[PDB]
Amino acid sequence: SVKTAWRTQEVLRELSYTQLWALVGEGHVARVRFYGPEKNKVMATTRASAPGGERLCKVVLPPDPELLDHLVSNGVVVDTGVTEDDRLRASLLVQML
Amino acid sequence: GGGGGGGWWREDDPYWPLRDWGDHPMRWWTLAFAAIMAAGGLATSVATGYVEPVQAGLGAGSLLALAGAAMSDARCVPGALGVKLAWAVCALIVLKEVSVGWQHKRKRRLAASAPRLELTGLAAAALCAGYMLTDMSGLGEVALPPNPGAVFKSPDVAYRASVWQKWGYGQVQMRV
Amino acid sequence: RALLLLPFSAVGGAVAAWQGLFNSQRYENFLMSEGERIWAWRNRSENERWFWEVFAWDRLIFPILVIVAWEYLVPNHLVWAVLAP
Amino acid sequence: FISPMTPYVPEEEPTRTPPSIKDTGTLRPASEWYPQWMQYRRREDNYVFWQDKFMRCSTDIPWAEKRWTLFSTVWYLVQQLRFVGTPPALRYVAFLGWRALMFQVYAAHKALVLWQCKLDAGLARIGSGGATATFSKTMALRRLHWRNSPLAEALYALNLYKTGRVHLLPPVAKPIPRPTFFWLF
Amino acid sequence: AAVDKAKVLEDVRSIISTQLGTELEKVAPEAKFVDLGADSLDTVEIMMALEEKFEIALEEEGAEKIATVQDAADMIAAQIAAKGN
Amino acid sequence: GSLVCQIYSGLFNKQISKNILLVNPKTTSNNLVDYNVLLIQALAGETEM
Numbered sequence: 001s002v003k004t005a006w007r008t009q010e011v012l013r014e015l016s017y018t019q020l021w022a023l024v025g026e027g028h029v030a031r032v033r034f035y036g037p038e039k040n041k042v043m044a045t046t047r048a049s050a051p052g053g054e055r056l057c058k059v060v061l062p063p064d065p066e067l068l069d070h071l072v073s074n075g076v077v078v079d080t081g082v083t084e085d086d087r088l089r090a091s092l093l094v095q096m097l
Numbered sequence: 098g099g100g101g102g103g104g105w106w107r108e109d110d111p112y113w114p115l116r117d118w119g120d121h122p123m124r125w126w127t128l129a130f131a132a133i134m135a136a137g138g139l140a141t142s143v144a145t146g147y148v149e150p151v152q153a154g155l156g157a158g159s160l161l162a163l164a165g166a167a168m169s170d171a172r173c174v175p176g177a178l179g180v181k182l183a184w185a186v187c188a189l190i191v192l193k194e195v196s197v198g199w200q201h202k203r204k205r206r207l208a209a210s211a212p213r214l215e216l217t218g219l220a221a222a223a224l225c226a227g228y229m230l231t232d233m234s235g236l237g238e239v240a241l242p243p244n245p246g247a248v249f250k251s252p253d254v255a256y257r258a259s260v261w262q263k264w265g266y267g268q269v270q271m272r273v
Numbered sequence: 274r275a276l277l278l279l280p281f282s283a284v285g286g287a288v289a290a291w292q293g294l295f296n297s298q299r300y301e302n303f304l305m306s307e308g309e310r311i312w313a314w315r316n317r318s319e320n321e322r323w324f325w326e327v328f329a330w331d332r333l334i335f336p337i338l339v340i341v342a343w344e345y346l347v348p349n350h351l352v353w354a355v356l357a358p
Numbered sequence: 359f360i361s362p363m364t365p366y367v368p369e370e371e372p373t374r375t376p377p378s379i380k381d382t383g384t385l386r387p388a389s390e391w392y393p394q395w396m397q398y399r400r401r402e403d404n405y406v407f408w409q410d411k412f413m414r415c416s417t418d419i420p421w422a423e424k425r426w427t428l429f430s431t432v433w434y435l436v437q438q439l440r441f442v443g444t445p446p447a448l449r450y451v452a453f454l455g456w457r458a459l460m461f462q463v464y465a466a467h468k469a470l471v472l473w474q475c476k477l478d479a480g481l482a483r484i485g486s487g488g489a490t491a492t493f494s495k496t497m498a499l500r501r502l503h504w505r506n507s508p509l510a511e512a513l514y515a516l517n518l519y520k521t522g523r524v525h526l527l528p529p530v531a532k533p534i535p536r537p538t539f540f541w542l543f
Numbered sequence: 544a545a546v547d548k549a550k551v552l553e554d555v556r557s558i559i560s561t562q563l564g565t566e567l568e569k570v571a572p573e574a575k576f577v578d579l580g581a582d583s584l585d586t587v588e589i590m591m592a593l594e595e596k597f598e599i600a601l602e603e604e605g606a607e608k609i610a611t612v613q614d615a616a617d618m619i620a621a622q623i624a625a626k627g628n
Numbered sequence: 629g630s631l632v633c634q635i636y637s638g639l640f641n642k643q644i645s646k647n648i649l650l651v652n653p654k655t656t657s658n659n660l661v662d663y664n665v666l667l668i669q670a671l672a673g674e675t676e677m
């Protein structure tokens with residue numbers, strides 16, 4: 001109901017493994033960001049060709065050793081939010097300390 | 098062009114808009130903004146099917162029309178309340194436009210969604226600045242309650258003790 | 274001949290000019306003007322200073338922080354969540 | 359009932375402090391300490407230079423400037439960082455830079471006002487044929503002292519452009535009162 | 544407010560002369576600015592210089608009626624007297 | 629005003645000490661709030677000194 005609700009910011013939208021697997025196999029997920037201390041949560045950034053455009057979804061999984069053989073099998077690039085610029089900023093902070 | 102009072106147009110009394118007619122200067126501006134907001138919301142909802150344009154359209158236009166009615170005598174408490182209500186509505190429009198965005202303006206790309214500040218937000222911010230720069234003083238007695246730091250050097254022992262007691266201290270020795 | 278190279282005198286002239294900028298009647302006038310502005314602002318505010326010096330941490334933020342911290346720390350027990358706090 | 363000719367204009371309490379006795383009102387920087395007209399006044403009648411500091415900052419504070427609000431709570435932090443959080447040396451060099459910039463912008467505004475006088479003469483010729491080609495020096499000083507609203511400026515320019523009448527001026531704009539929105543500002 | 548009108552007139556004459564080009568002699572009290580050949584805009588520039596020198600606000604209504612150096616000094620001296628209040 | 633601005637500027641800390649005579653003529657009945665001590669206390673309270 002995108003024509004009925006008011007717009008309220010952009011919150012994540014908790015999915016499930018099955019939902020994410022469906023939209024990964026159908027080629028709607030562009031990038032995944034594994035997060036959680038236990039690394040069991042995923043930020044899924046969808047592509048513009050998906051039915052809904054770019055949406056940053058949030059998925060929680062069981063530990064299934066078949067995620068890679070679906071994501072990189074179809075199209076999905078895994079990534080982490082800590083780039084070399086963030087690492088160098090951390091090194092600068094350690095130097096200041 | 099014929100609002101507020103009379104009008105002469107380059108013959109006699111040329112500076113007639115600046116005469117005090119009894120109303121707020123921004124009365125016809127907020128009434129015109131209410132009219133164009135209601136019309137644009139109804140037209141957008143008819144053209145697209147989204148219901149946020151009509152709900153955030155006529156719903157804010159009615160409040161702006163009531164504020165413009167209350168600003169027709171801007172020398173009273175209804176005038177002050179009307180200019181405050183109109184500023185609140187226009188500030189809410191600006192806030193929604195630059196923070197959340199418009200649902201019917203949702204697009205596929207995240208960079209294309211981009212809440213931004215379009216003509217409606219610009220007009221509401223211009224109305225806000227018009228209220229601030231013409232007249233908003235009035236109902237200045239409504240503020241946060243005075244602190245015990247206000248009444249530390251106050252010459253009124255009764256007022257200092259009233260603020261003392263209201264702010265929870267109460268039994269602290271005054272020694273004044 | 275020319276000993277002026279490697280200009281330690283020119284890099285110390287910046288500090289000399291910095292020292293000479295102050296201790297003048299212009300800087301005394303600026304300080305007195307700043308005292309006037311501080312006096313005006315201190316008479317204007319008189320409530321926000323008490324809010325920020327007395328109220329804002331001790332009676333607004335710190336009780337919220339310790340209650341949220343205690344409820345985040347202690348187990349989901351009636352004694353630890355209600356009666357002991 | 360007891361209608362005294364003129365319709366009673368209610369005199370509300372002031373919301374802004376009156377401008378200082380050393381002010382110029384023309385976007386030019388004021389003097390450093392002494393407003394330079396005291397030398398053209400007698401001694402012991404220049405007592406109202408400190409009697410402006412008193413009742414501009416101690417004894418005649420408008421109560422609209424003592425209002426406690428969320429915006430004033432936030433703004434106290436900016437003022438505290440300016441006064442007790444930033445060194446007076448850096449405040450002094452920034453004060454000198456702002457003084458020089460304000461002198462430059464005053465020279466720019468003065469040149470703009472003189473050009474507006476020339477435009478005043480041009481619009482007063484196109485609208486009265488060729489007879490009236492002067493310009494209002496009182497309106498020139500009014501533009502320089504920022505006493506005119508943009509609506510007053512537009513109405514006067516239009517008035518010149520289609521009937522002439524240089525010495526028929528718009529009303530002086532009232533000072534803008536301090537805006538108040540309950541507990542917000 | 545007991546303004547020294549002689550001092551005010553002397554400084555007014557000095558400002559008028561300084562802007563235009565004449566000496567302090569040619570700027571006489573009874574002399575009209577028109578005699579000195581200051582144009583309309585030049586008279587306005589002279590009023591601006593007087594405002595800048597005396598650090599006061601010139602009485603706008605009545606600036607169209609500043610004809611003599613004596614009138615300029617009298618309006619200025621009245622404004623110096625009215626500034627302190 | 630000179631004393632208040634010297635205090636708020638900090639210069640009163642490093643200024644030369646001075647003596648000032650105050651005259652309030654004897655017309656108050658008994659000791660019903662002396663205006664000299666009232667004025668000096670207001671000076672010190674305004675300056676927080």
Ligand SMILES: CCCCCCCCCCCCCCCCCC(=O)OC[C@H](CO[C@@H]1O[C@H](CO[C@H]2O[C@H](CO)[C@H](O)[C@H](O)[C@H]2O)[C@H](O)[C@H](O)[C@H]1O)OC(=O)CCCCCCCCCCCCCCCCC
Pocket residue numbers: 294440444448449451452453454455456457459
């Ligand atoms: C001979 C010496 C050599 C150097 C001297 C001159 C060269 C360079 C001068 C400074 C750099 C450029 C300044 C231009 C704009 C001013 C910056 C500013 O924002 O404006 C500063 C204002 C102006 O000062 C105060 O300003 C007050 C408020 O007025 C103005 O205050 C603001 C001005 O920003 C607003 O614009 C506001 O609208 C307007 O009213 C008063 O009116 C007075 O003017 C005065 O008390 O201060 C404040 O509030 C903020 C206080 C802290 C800000 C510090 C900014 C810069 C510090 C440089 C330190 C480096 C040290 C090395 C020396 C070399 C310098 C680069």
